[PDB]
Design a protein around this ligand. Sequence first.
Ligand SMILES: *[C@@H]1O[C@H](CO)[C@@H](O[C@@H]2O[C@H](CO)[C@@H](O)[C@H](O)[C@H]2NC(C)=O)[C@H](O)[C@H]1NC(C)=O
Ligand SMILES: *[C@@H]1O[C@H](CO)[C@@H](O)[C@H](O)[C@H]1NC(C)=O
Ligand SMILES: *[C@@H]1[C@H](O)[C@@H](O)[C@H](O)[C@@H](CN[N+]#N)[C@H]1O
Length: 497
Amino acid sequence: ARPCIPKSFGYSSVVCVCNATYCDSFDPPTFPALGTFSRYESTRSGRRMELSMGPIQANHTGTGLLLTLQPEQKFQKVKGFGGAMTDAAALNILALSPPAQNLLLKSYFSEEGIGYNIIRVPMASCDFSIRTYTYADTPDDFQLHNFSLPEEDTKLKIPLIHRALQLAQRPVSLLASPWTSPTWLKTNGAVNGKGSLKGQPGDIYHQTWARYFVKFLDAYAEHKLQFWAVTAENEPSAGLLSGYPFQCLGFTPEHQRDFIARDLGPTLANSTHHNVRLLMLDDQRLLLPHWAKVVLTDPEAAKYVHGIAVHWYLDFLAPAKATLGETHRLFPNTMLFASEACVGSKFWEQSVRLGSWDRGMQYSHSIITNLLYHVVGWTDWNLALNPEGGPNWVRNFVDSPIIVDITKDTFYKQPMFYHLGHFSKFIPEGSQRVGLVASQKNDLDAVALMHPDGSAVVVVLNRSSKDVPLTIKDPAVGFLETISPGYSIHTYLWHRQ
Ligand SMILES: *[C@@H]1O[C@H](CO)[C@@H](O[C@@H]2O[C@H](CO)[C@@H](O)[C@H](O)[C@H]2NC(C)=O)[C@H](O)[C@H]1NC(C)=O
Ligand SMILES: *[C@@H]1O[C@H](CO)[C@@H](O)[C@H](O)[C@H]1NC(C)=O
Ligand SMILES: *[C@@H]1[C@H](O)[C@@H](O)[C@H](O)[C@@H](CN[N+]#N)[C@H]1O
């Protein structure tokens, strides 16, 4: 293990400072002996995923908070956790010296870090790019004879994805999302603003756009990268808005439905990439369940849709049950997956707030709410940004768990990094959420899961200032007596036999 080198930037908590020769890292994962539990703790006061162990007690008495495991109450199985390899993320990472690059990638993807097993890949340019480009900018190239990956893919994104996959012990899943089509496929002839595909589903514009997906997957496959899934479009609602400032492609739910049924579904199904999953929506959960009903009550569309991708704007609030809950109830066999989450969105908020414990708590609160409402995965936005929260060609700056200081050959691991880690490191793919009931009203957020091997994991977040004594009951083993300190997050792990 190497501990956090803490640094204050004058906000509520510290960042952990990493450079070419030093980064905080875990010892190789270990199992707690039966009758004992493992605790990982992070606190505003400065603890960063610190490991301790205690006994599981056969007996318990008290009037104190009891969380009871309900291991026979089984919910969703987990796909995984990770973040986005944007042009901005890749340019920042590759601006560090090679040894520093390796420590940053190890922080995210290694068992010595937090075990990310998802990477979201933009299909060409987004706002977290330093120029606008698509893979097919030659006007009216319906055959896509001038389709090609620029340097952003071949020199920045692809080599970093190879290196991330080399460092991971878990199999990593790639998720691809487009922001814009070529401008000659669009009613407005521009990468941004209000505009959809020209013509009607089934026509040459719609078929060229579907074939563009296959050309993307073919080009990544020539670089020995295979995708788990694609989304039908990043934030299709954005391209319906007049003056939308960055790359978008407008679809109504009806247009997405007919595009999937007539073009994208059949085209992927007839390709060598037929095993790639398609996720619909990839947008705000306020659009649910209406968007899911429009698309999935048409069997010609539904037979191609594996899942519903959702976006979180953490600065803002929204109701989970009415959106994620009702959607699961209508379409229980169509997985919900959180594909994008960001903080620092509002006009009056600093883009990057180095050492913000509040933004850490926003991430962990959001992941717990998602896991409590059937969501199988949770994908951060940019893996790394600069201290301004860029680069970003429209100055749409936001925060990132890792901030790169190129002038210092340094990177800072924010509280958000550790809040994400409390989930990503300890909830492997195939983990199943199970029931967890409180004996009394309490200020804590918690969720329980069982690993594929039958072991238990519980995450407990305390967003209050008050220490909360509590016991976790598992009927198979006994009682974990513990305390949730104010402004803390804990992960608890134990074997059940
Ligand atoms: C990278 O960070 C490490 C850890 O903070 C720095 O190593 C420390 O260097 C100082 C000053 O030389 C010593 O007082 C400490 O004993 C070192 N700590 C450890 C844990 O080794 C290192 O100097 C930094 N590298 C650069 C180029 O700034
Ligand atoms: C399209 O690609 C071909 C073959 O690489 C090339 O000769 C041609 O000039 C390209 N056209 C444009 C407009 O780039
Ligand atoms: C999600 C969106 O797809 C992405 O382009 C954007 O940068 C973030 C944060 N800011 N904004 N707008 C999300 O919207």
